[PDB]
């Protein structure tokens, strides 16, 4: 008995520290069977996906990590968050932002804390599975509806199988020293990543809420004509 | 008892034509309250929704079905598609869009028909709920990934309620005239629109099969290091 489709999406949260259980290959294979059954425009299936487990997960996110550590600054290809911040965004980003440092016992401004915490995105929260996600260079705008899509169904195909995830755009930071680490052929662009694992169920930053706005903030429901 | 995630994931398809039977009012709220709990990057919900039904949403497919059947031209303002088409992507749009003619009967020279099936877009697909996505102008790249997220959440709750979907970039073509007969704000753009509804199981557009990729062909993995 599977979990069911509603169960998915309600339990699905983004998880930053997971367990040492690792996923076996036959489930990700799985997970990413069930993602390419997203729908995409005219079939187009843009997606391309790199699978990191065990000594080359932790190479590379041993060494991410480290570029953050050292101060080394981000250069993405794309811009992802506005430019011009402004509310209701603003709140938003700040709500979630000082509730996961409430969850972790750090201060805003403590920038030895913030930025430790920060790195461990890049060794997937210490996930057992990281995803990093590709494009190649002749796709346009719809391409990334299709890959949202793709990824969504991955968070929730997940929770089928009792795994968790997280989406991060943080990878987007370092596409150049992840382009060398992997080989990334160069006609590819590396739009984010996902970690993929078991949570630990007990850590503090696992056990926060995040808030939704009320649908009728954000849906116009229209019937009538004239 | 609703259906399980991957029943939901497998079992959704682009469904393109539709029974007369109307959607509660209480069944689309709940639909979206569940996409409203996708992910988003730092929590930002770009997402917008216009749900139509009723007489403004026949009257909506009546104008703009109309602007193709007279001849009048899109005009997108961004780039959906790839402007350079190259293989794989070719033979898979051929594929979907032959396979789709095949199943409607549309022969090679067809013009009208192809031209009548074209704008059965603009209706929605006689869908009994039409749905348009808009987001905010200060919204960069990332909100499009946010964007696909909640979409695909929308298309799999739906069939919880044993409802379909078809996504459909087909609207951004008139977004000048869609932005007038709705009032859309002037800070918000037009993205995509949805059909929503129950399928007509006995219509052949309804009653064919689409590929994907076998995964080598897009994932790799990789484990060992060096
Ligand atoms: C972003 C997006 C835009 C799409 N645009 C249209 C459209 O305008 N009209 C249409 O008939 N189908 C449209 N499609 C549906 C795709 O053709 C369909 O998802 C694809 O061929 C795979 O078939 P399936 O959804 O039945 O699995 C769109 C799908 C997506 C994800
Ligand atoms: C495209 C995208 C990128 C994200 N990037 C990151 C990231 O780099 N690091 C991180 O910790 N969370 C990241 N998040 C997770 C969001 O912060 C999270 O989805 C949002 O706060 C809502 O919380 P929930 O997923 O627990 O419902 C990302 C989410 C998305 C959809
Ligand atoms: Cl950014
Ligand atoms: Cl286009």
Redesign the interface.
């Known amino acids: 008995?599977?979990?069911?489709?509603?169960?998915?999406?309600?339990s699905?949260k983004?998880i930053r520290a997971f367990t040492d259980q690792p996923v076996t290959?036959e489930t990700?294979?799985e997970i990413?069977?069930?993602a390419?059954?997203?729908?995409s425009?005219?079939?187009?299936?843009?997606?391309?996906?790199?699978?990191?487990?065990?000594?080359?997960?932790?190479?590379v996110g041993q060494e991410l990590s480290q570029l953050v550590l050292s101060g080394i600054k981000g250069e993405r290809e794309?811009?992802?968050?506005?430019?011009?911040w402004?509310e209701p965004?603003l709140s938003?980003?700040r709500?979630?932002?000082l509730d996961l440092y409430k969850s972790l016992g750090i201060q805003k401004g403590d920038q030895e804390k913030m930025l430790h915490q920060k790195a461990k995105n890049f060794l997937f929260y210490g996930a057992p599975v990281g995803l990093l996600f590709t494009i190649?260079h002749?796709?346009?705008?719809?391409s990334?509806?299709?890959?949202?899509?793709?990824?969504?169904?991955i968070?929730?195909?997940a929770?089928?199988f009792g795994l968790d995830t997280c989406?991060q755009?943080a990878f987007a930071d370092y596409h150049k020293q992840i382009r060398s680490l992997?080989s990334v052929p160069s006609d590819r662009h590396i739009?984010?990543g996902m970690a993929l694992g078991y949570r630990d169920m007990n850590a503090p930053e696992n056990n926060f809420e995040?808030?939704?706005?009320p649908?009728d903030n954000?849906?116009?429901?229209?019937?009538?004509?004239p």
């Open positions: 008995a599977p979990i069911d489709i509603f169960q998915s999406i309600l699905r983004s290959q990700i294979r990413l069977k069930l390419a059954r997203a729908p425009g005219t079939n187009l299936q843009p997606w391309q996906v790199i699978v990191l487990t065990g000594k080359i997960l932790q190479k794309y811009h992802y968050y506005p430019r011009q402004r965004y938003r980003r709500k979630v932002g190649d002749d796709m346009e705008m719809g990334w509806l299709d890959l949202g899509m793709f990824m969504q169904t968070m929730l195909a929770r089928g989406a755009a992997l739009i984010c995040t808030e939704r706005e649908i954000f849906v116009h429901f229209i019937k009538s004509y």
